[PDB]
Amino acid sequence: TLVHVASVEKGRSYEDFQKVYNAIALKLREDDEYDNYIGYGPVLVRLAWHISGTWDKHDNTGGSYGGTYRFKKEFNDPSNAGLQNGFKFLEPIHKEFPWISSGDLFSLGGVTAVQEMQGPKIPWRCGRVDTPEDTTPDNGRLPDADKDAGYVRTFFQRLNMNDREVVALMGAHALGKTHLKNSGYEGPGGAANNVFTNEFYLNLLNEDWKLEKNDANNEQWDSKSGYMMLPTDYSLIQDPKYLSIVKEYANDQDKFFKDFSKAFEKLLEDGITFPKDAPSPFIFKTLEEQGL
């Protein structure tokens, strides 16, 4: 019941944040080899989600505001295994722009990755403020993958997301891959998708899925094509309400982009109070738009 008021980094404006965006985007382009040539796009999206997804609407603990992923309890959350790669990517960015708060940097990294991967524009607001180590939420607030649609629906109520918002946000699972050592769910061994599209929904609907056990003895849904879905992914076509929305996004790229952009911004802003005279949300230009 904590109040976190957005406070703009002193004297900073749109141009300052576009510079940070640009530095992230340029490094995304440069460090192209990461994870068998997937690049750092997907892991930066996952990082922005995990630092936000600790939020609890009931007492306003967790959330992106405090930048608490920088503290050992949170960065060592078993749910966050692999995200150290995103944090290391952002380290030199933070060094170049030491004035940006940690929450702002982690959330901006997600926005930048989505846009640079040809996703929708995601309006972004500055003003998250680093909070002390004792404000770090405990482990166990991020969702399990081995569960069903009812679990997913209930889980996301804590983040104030409804069915449409849940289904839209899950479209980010078009990006990157599971890594057996991180999560107990499997390779492809090589490259995966690093372009932001509605392919998650198309694959759910069109692939011939088989329920198999992986080398970690966990069940996952696999296709002959070499794709996989988590049990929680597959639950979106098992539940009739989720299934309708899956079909909608599979058949309308623009609608998916618009809904994802709204839900992703909301996720990244949950728990933050923006003063009435705060700057309007910024919409950053991509490198391509800038001729960079």
Ligand X SMILES: N=C(N)C1CCCC1
Burial of 104 (0-12, 13-18, 19+ CB in 10 A): buried
Instruction: Choose which of 193, 198, 232, 261 interacts with ligand HEM (CB under 6 A).
Output: 232
Q: Are 238 and 228 in contact (CB under 8 A)?
A: no
131: helix, coil or strand?
coil
Instruction: Choose which of 41, 176, 231, 271 interacts with ligand X (CB under 6 A).
Output: 176
Distance CA 222, CA 230 (A): 9
Which DSSP string do the residues of 233-271 spell out, in sequence order?
HHHHHHSHHHHHHHHHHHT-HHHHHHHHHHHHHHHHHTT
Contact mark string toward ligand HEM, 47..86, x via CB under 6 A: --x--------------------------------x----
Q: Does 229 bind ligand X (CB under 6 A)?
A: yes
DSSP E strand stretches across 68-206: none
Q: Does 279 bind ligand HEM (CB under 6 A)?
A: no
**Candidate ranges 55-63, 126-134, 178-186, 208-216; the one touching ligand HEM (CB under 6 A):** 178-186
Contact mark string toward ligand HEM, 202..221, x via CB under 6 A: --------------------
Q: Does 183 bind ligand HEM (CB under 6 A)?
A: yes
Q: Does 145 bind ligand HEM (CB under 6 A)?
A: yes
Nearest-approach distance from CB 142 to ligand X, in angstroms: 13
77 binds, among ligand X, ligand HEM, none (CB under 5 to 8 A by kind): none
One-letter amino acid at 176 equals G
Q: Are 123 and 281 in contact (CB under 8 A)?
A: yes
